[PDB]
Amino acid sequence: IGIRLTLPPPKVVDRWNEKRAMFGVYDNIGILGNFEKHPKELIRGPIWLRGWKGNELQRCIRKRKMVGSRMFADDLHNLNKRIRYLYKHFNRHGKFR
Amino acid sequence: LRNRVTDRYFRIQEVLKHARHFRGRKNRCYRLAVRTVIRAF
């Protein structure tokens, strides 16, 4: 009974809207623009993970380091607890040692 | 619930079709029908 009895409303996707049409443009800004701008500078998103990647523990540490002072009180408490738990898990648990 | 199973009905039916001719709940309840059908096969 976890199956719907009617077809869902048709999902129409415009493959040629502006976003999809111009997707990927300026990804070669560096190599094709005398390296004035690195492609990572085209990344719009959280300040603490622009042009950067890492596991959950590294991401949490970076968030606390970079925007920790601007975080809300309970969000920062949650982040501190999450960092503590991730530290314990990654440094004391796992199949391999 | 990023990814949810939507075929569970057909997954259940693939087993129940072989149990439709059993006796009792073994022909209706998957938790029982699956065991009986495996034994039957």
Binding site: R4, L5, P8 | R4
Partner: peptide, 26 residues
């Protein structure tokens, strides 16, 4: 509601089959 279309389509086909079996056409 579970997002997706293919399971719903399969169930629609099964419902059509059951409808035909219950009320076979002339």
């Amino acid at each position: 509601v579970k997002k997706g279309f293919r399971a719903a389509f399969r169930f629609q086909k099964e419902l059509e089959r059951q409808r035909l079996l219950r009320c076979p056409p002339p």
